[PDB]
Amino acid sequence: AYQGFTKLGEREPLNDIILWEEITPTGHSRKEYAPVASTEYRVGEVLKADGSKVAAGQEAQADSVCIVNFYADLQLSYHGQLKVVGIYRDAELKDLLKLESGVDAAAVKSALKAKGIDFVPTG
Amino acid sequence: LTNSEKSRFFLADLTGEVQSIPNTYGYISGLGLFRSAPQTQTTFLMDLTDWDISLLDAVDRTSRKAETSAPERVRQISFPMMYFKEVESITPDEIQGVRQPGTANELTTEAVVRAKKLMKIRTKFDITREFLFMQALKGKVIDANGVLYADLYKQFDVTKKTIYFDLDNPNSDIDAHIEDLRMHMEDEAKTGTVINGEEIHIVVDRTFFSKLIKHPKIRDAYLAQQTPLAWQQITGSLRTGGTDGVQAHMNRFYYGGVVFVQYNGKFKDKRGKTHTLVSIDGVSDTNVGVGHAFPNVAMLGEANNIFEVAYAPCPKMGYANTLGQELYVFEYEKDRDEGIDFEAHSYMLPYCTRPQLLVDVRSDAE
Amino acid sequence: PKMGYANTLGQELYVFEYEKDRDEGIDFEAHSYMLPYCTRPQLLVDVRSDAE
């Protein structure tokens, strides 16, 4: 390119952050959201109750952790699903978290830990 | 037998003809480093995947707690390629009446002119290829004009490594800098195999070689030796190896497990500015020596080759979607017997898939 | 001055035929590079019908 380098992009995070979850016939720790407006979800981003990403100052209202890769242009997930699913109940994820700008992790982790979501150290 | 000077009626002799062919350098081209990779499309991609490892932290037994490891990282990059086109024409009015140099009264034909034009075109493309290969060895592929085509360090997200030998200081540790350069390749190769850092090529310019072979430490070390190598290096020809484009034997020097080869290659562009092959873009202090160290072919093995050159087809009416070629030459005749047209095409890019291994070398101190 | 004819013996008339693109027709061309001369111009004398 005119800038000297062309980077076609990085592979989107894989749905591997889940280490343990309450496995039930209908799914216990997973809830589906309505994709809000033109929003690009990825694996490991913390969502609010309505479905939008947690922003700075809104840490206490951390509702779940996204575990699907959604595309605003297609209005479809990377598995061709109409909804976006997050983890909001008893489960144990990895430290990989796609936080927003200016949002502290500790408040997000404590809010999620209140609901029974645990994070394991990652090397 | 041709007309004498001063008189059109007496005769003289035309013994012969002397020619001054310009110097051409082909050391990097003749090294065989850049394996040929013919290409069909105009761009080629590449996948970059890597992982990392860390140390376990001790965790108590009764409180059953553990650790986890981060997943891999997969990216992708793309490469554009340079297109070189060169046109030359033959006309009847540069053949009619004109006399063949070195001959008394015989006339130039179309065959000799065509042969010399084709030879010049091929030589120009060869020197351009050598310059491009040297630039790719430097880690940044800059066109002769100066436009950037592929910056390998930003594309692969690596930083250039340069080593200051400090040849001026008599107390400098040449062994320490040599060891640093040797271990850099082993550390930064990251191929997953076992690396031998002694298998590298160190190509330096005249000044760096002169300062290196005249360092008090090196000379005093080699003078107090009774081996044939030391005798040759001190009082003997320092020109083993070679078969350079100009000289029959290149200067090279054995100090550690590595060798230092002096490469004098340089070319000029249309603007007239010279392009020294062994140089650093920016440095010109004249009194500082520069060099370039790159891994040998037999260091990472043939399975992991990092020096490749691509070739893609020219945009002609029947060469589309075919394997690339080193050079295309086309014959086109002017209408109304007005002449002959020549076109030469070459669509290439030399690149390095592990730019971290390309290490720069300087003679001054940081 | 055409390719394949340079540095060759000249002729009285050079007639060429060229095919126009897309069979649009045929183009002709007649060439003649000549000059007559007399080696002894002193033998060429003019005669006039009037007194000096």
Q: Which of 107-146 (B) contact C at CB < 8 A?
A: 107, 110
Q: Compute the distance between CA of residue B263 and CA of residue B276 in angstroms, rounded to an integer.
A: 10
Length of chain C measured in residues: 52
Nearest to B86 by CA among B353, B321, B343, B332: B343
Structure tokens belonging to residue C37: 């001369």
Kindly give, in sequence order, each residue whose CB lies less than 8 Å from that of residue B233, ignoring residues fewer than 6 positions away. B213, B222, B253, B254
Resolution in Å equals 3.2
Q: Is B149 on the interface with A (CB under 8 A)?
A: yes
Q: Which residues pair with B360 in a beta bridge?
A: B162, B292
Contact flag A11-B73 (C-beta cutoff 8 Å) = yes
Q: How far is B134 from chain C (nearest CA, A)?
A: 42
Mutate to test the interface with A, among B60, B67, B68 (most CBs of A within 10 A): B68
Q: Note whether B164 and B364 are within 8 A (CB).
A: yes
CA A61 to chain centre: 14
Q: Is there an interface between A and C (3+ Cβ pairs < 8 A)? A: no
Q: Which of 2-41 (C) contact B at CB < 8 A?
A: 2-7, 16, 18, 27, 29
Contact flag A8-B45 (C-beta cutoff 8 Å) = yes
Q: Compute the distance between CA of residue B363 and CA of residue B260 in angstroms, rounded to an integer.
A: 13
Method by which the model was determined? cryo-EM
A13 to chain B: which residues are within 8 Å by CB?
A: 71
Q: Compute the distance between CA of residue A14 and CA of residue A3 in angstroms, rounded to an integer.
A: 30
Q: How far is C52 from chain B (nearest CA, A)?
A: 44
Contact flag C4-B334 (C-beta cutoff 8 Å) = no
